[PDB]
Design a protein around this ligand. Structure first.
Ligand SMILES: *NCCCCNC(=N)N
Lengths: 381, 42
């Protein structure tokens, strides 16, 4: 059972083309400010793949740092994303883009980030006592006034029924207080925390929001397959739903031709679970391997909207076609359903929050009810 | 993280999406999970 960072080292060094890209993707980052520092501006930018591997190995036993406590004014788009911070500028280079599109690279990244996920759901923090996972969160600043208020404010911004305290909003273990970071046993439990009962009431409407999320795109009359790589990223159902690799989804692609795609963004300080947008019977469910740090040329150096200081933020439509993601298709033409045909739900990973966890209530053949929790993003691959 | 919801052509004729979702440039906050996204009109 080899260290997945060591497997990645060997992949890079035992393949001449990946060896070349692993240098060039750093050489192509400008030396001049602001790129001498990573996008948080708090540390020097990494300039070679060996320091990158060293840091990746170190991160396997670290939780993300809440660096806004002692530095409230630096860019905050990569809160929660220590791997993303290291490769953000490389992601924006031509060689970096080619590197992070490579399937072998992304298998290695998957295994690295899944190994990280093991630590993030470990309540001992890899053998540092029964309260280690909790203490690591406190050490990382997550119980500071600044972090807690940011989480409280972010939850309140979407509702008129506002709460004063974190414990009135989110479920956490017994005797949780701010000082003990609500007795969350590990990062994963804090990350996938649930709302308290009644804090997110299920509306009467036929479709409700699946995620606590910020609207991004609403496209009508979408195509079977499209040039999703051109400026504006027209949606390509065939690629997004994985008909490239699963002939079973092709009929649903055809059934969505002419339909509409709505896309919304989940911030790091937002609720990360998934709720059923409609009532119906699950007729298709998949997971799709893909990229983690692939962003558009437009989001890179010299690009018309680049370099993204928090890639793939400005490439969200693009990555729906290539990133690690999942597909759920619900039939609402059933008893108790709203009779609006087939509804698709496509959670799409971004960077090291790319673990798509379908709950067992979403197995094909089962019926989900509007508002039920049906899955969650996790930090991981 | 991000996610998509996908609706069929004949269903979209029957639905009224809330403005914050259909016209994303107007949105200034998260939408609340479980809250209304679209309602039937016929
Ligand atoms: N959708 C999860 C949050 C992703 C935040 N952006 C980023 N890591 N670049």
């Amino acid at each position: 059972v080899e260290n997945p960072v060591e497997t990645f080292r060997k992949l890079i060094e035992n393949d001449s083309t990946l060896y070349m890209l692993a240098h060039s993707m750093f050489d192509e980052v400008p030396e001049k400010a602001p790129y001498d520092r990573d996008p948080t501006t708090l540390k020097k930018q990494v300039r070679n793949y060996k320091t990158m591997l060293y840091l990746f190995n170190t991160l396997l036993t670290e939780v993300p740092e809440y660096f806004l406590r002692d530095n409230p004014n630096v860019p905050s788009g990569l809160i929660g994303f220590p791997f993303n911070i290291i490769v953000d500028w490389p992601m924006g280079t031509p060689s970096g883009r080619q590197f992070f599109l490579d399937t072998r690279v992304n298998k290695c990244l998957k295994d690295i980030l899944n190994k990280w996920n093991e630590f993030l759901k470990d309540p001992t923090a890899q053998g540092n006592g029964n309260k280690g996972g909790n203490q690591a969160l406190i050490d990382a600043g997550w119980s500071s006034d600044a972090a807690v208020e940011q989480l409280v404010n972010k939850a309140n911004e979407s509702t008129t029924d506002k709460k004063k305290t974190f414990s009135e909003i989110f479920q956490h273990p017994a005797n949780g207080t701010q000082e003990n970071f609500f007795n969350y046993a590990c990062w994963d439990n804090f990350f996938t925390r649930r709302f308290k009962d009644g804090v997110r009431p299920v509306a009467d409407a036929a479709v409700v929001n699946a995620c606590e999320s910020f609207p991004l795109s609403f496209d009508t009359d979408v195509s079977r397959r499209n040039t999703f790589w051109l400026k504006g990223t027209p949606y390509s159902l065939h690629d997004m739903l994985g008909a490239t690799q699963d002939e079973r989804v092709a009929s649903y692609v055809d059934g969505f031709v002419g339909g509409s795609v709505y896309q919304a963004f989940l911030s790091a300080d937002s609720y990360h679970c998934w709720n059923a947008p409609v009532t119906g019977k699950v007729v298709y469910r998949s997971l799709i391997d893909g990229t983690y740090f692939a962003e558009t040329a437009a989001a890179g150096f010299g690009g018309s909207n680049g370099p993204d200081p928090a890639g793939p933020d400005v490439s969200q439509r693009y990555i729906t076609h290539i990133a690690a993601r999942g597909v759920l298709i619900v039939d609402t033409n059933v008893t108790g359903g709203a009779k609006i045909g087939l509804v698709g739900f496509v959670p799409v990973g971004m960077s090291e929050v790319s673990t798509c966890d379908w709950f067992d209530n979403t197995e094909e053949g089962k019926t989900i009810s509007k508002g039920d929790v049906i899955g969650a993003f996790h930090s991981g691959g | 993280x991000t996610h998509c919801l996908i609706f069929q052509r004949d269903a979209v004729k029957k639905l009224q999406f809330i403005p914050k979702a259909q016209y994303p440039e107007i949105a200034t906050t998260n939408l609340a999970v479980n809250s209304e996204l679209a309602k039937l009109t016929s």
